[model samples]
Target: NSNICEVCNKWGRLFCCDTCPRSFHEHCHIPSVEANKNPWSCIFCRIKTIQERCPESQSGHQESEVLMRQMLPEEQLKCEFLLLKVYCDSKSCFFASEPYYNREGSQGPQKPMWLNKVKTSLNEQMYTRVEGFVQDMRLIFHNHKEFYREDKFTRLGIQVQDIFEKNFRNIFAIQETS
Candidate 1:
């Protein structure tokens, strides 16, 4: 069958909502509901329902939506890139060269070369033109893992990875829809 789950694109146990043509796999469905007498709507359809009711003149919500929809690819890239830059900056401070401290001398970890390189090179202006932003960031992350002590490395790596997964996934998902 041509039907597939919207989330995972898998074939098994597909449930087609009566209200929408989209089908969802049993496991991939979020907020799964009982197939009651009334028609059911897919997650996206439900989201759209709420989105459609937003009053155009109410503050800037409508303007922001229009602005986002009109962003050129370069603009969208810049938007995503700036967020990535913020993430890098925060991490740089965490592993800064001049570690913030008190009576305890040299207690904080000095910044690694990779972190320093990223903090200096990355900028909002370059987001539209730079091709290696992700690569450099990834390299810094790898080097952080390779260079730091086991406990510190694991903690830093895990935290960054978690942020990366959740934030980027949501950002890109919105971009894809737009």
Candidate 2:
């Protein structure tokens, strides 16, 4: 039987620490250990855990804290712009080779006018899909990397599976199956 959480008074996950046998929610642990998998000692008593041993082991916590900061609408828009920056960087070489591919060029879909329209339409579509941001970021980041770097996102090429999984989920859920 789980005890009441000291903080939220919700049912706790049968927590126990060395000094005191107390219950806490999985989310309530200061450094938050997983449930039932440990004879866990709380942060105060967890002497040999990673944080205590390796002061340089900060990246995981740092990354999660970064992730936890909710992406504001403005930040999302900024990130979308970053995606385009990556895209424009990719086309830089091609434009260099064919001066007519320049934004000032008098012809082609890559011209300033056409590119502006494409950017507008893309932002509109992306804004609508922003609520499903987990999916959107995956696509945008992948395409960003692909356009800039001919190879996949990973040095060892593990990105292929992630790319395929994203496409599969989108195709199945949307049912338009692109």
Candidate 3:
């Protein structure tokens, strides 16, 4: 048993996410992990729950054409919360603590292309445009495809990237231009 919550890293009375390998303390999760009788998922996947309850609510608003910096604070939250994949399933695999130690000793995540680093980037106010943020995220997934070709980590990379791409459009209001 993993016996620990990823968020609090605490033991006892745990709750396991139905969709991910991570475990959490019941209260450590948002909204307190209620409905104990039903199957559960983490907050990142909450979009699915709402869509199931009422599909039309899926997108009741139009995406604003404002530049990323103009919508700074509110937009930042969306990007930060999107990092839930890293918090829940990351298993300490990618973070800013140290370089990946790529044996080639050339350059690899040498600037710490951490999933957590994405959050740090937002926190440090390093980006003025969504694409500025998009680039680092792509780097992580691209590396994922290159390394650990077929494994859980690579899958997580793709899955998280899927969220990024799907939400990326809404987050930035990028639409088909053709």
Candidate 4:
């Protein structure tokens, strides 16, 4: 038997994946939860679909560069009217990038250590840790992609869980807010 889909936690979907699963129930798994009967690969497939229909890619190096080019000059001005997490015109994109805001200020994400090392170095340590974790995740994700199997995906899921858990600490602290 194959592993279950990560989102729906059901069998009969794609065998395995690292960055994400290869398939999902259109109804149970997508953010919008597709109503269409046609099979879908997963949420990313929807992103690609919209990207193809729209003017540009939703992700990848080219897309990021294009986005930066389009948004950079306005970036500073945008920091105002823009909701703290709003990085794109699309609602989905905004939600996708939103993270837990430190209570010190809910106006925006606490500037990451990538921005400074002065915040007790704890934030700095977290930034470095997440960077390393993501680096490792990319390496292993592609590695598992190449092999195309279940255990690799299970391990990647565990790694992703770890990343998510660690990020919660880096981004917020109960005592710090008090």
Candidate 3, residue 24: Cα displacement in angstroms equals 9.8
Prediction 3 TM-score vs. true: 0.47
In candidate 4, stretches whose alpha carbon ends up further than 4 angstroms from where it belongs are: 1-3, 8-21, 25-28, 32-36, 39-41, 53-178
| Model 1 lDDT per residue over 133-167, tens place | 44454554555555454645447765665654444
- The local distance difference test score of each candidate is 0.47, 0.38, 0.57, 0.31
Ranking by TM-score: 3, 1, 4, 2
Question: What digit string (tens of lDDT, one per residue) describes model 3 on residues 9-86?
Answer: 768888877776667776445434666645677655554554456655444343344333442654554455455434
Per residue, candidate 4 scores C-alpha lDDT tens digits across 108-140 of 322321101111222223323223323332343
Per-residue alpha-carbon lDDT of model 2 for 1-178, expressed as tens digits? 2366543456735475654555566544433445565555553344224334665543322323333435554334433333333232323222212223322322232222222333444446544433343344344334334344444322222343344344333322222332
Q: What is the C-alpha RMSD of each candidate to the true structure, in Å?
A: 14.8, 19.3, 8.1, 17.7
Q: In model 2, how many backbone clashes occur?
A: 0
Per-candidate TM equals: 0.36, 0.22, 0.47, 0.23
List pairs with backbone clashes in candidate 3: none
The 10 consecutive residues of candidate 1 with the worst lDDT sum are: 55-64
Clashing pairs in 2: none
lDDT leader:
3
In lDDT terms, how accurate is model 3? 0.57
Off by over 4 Å in 2: 1-61, 91-135, 139-178
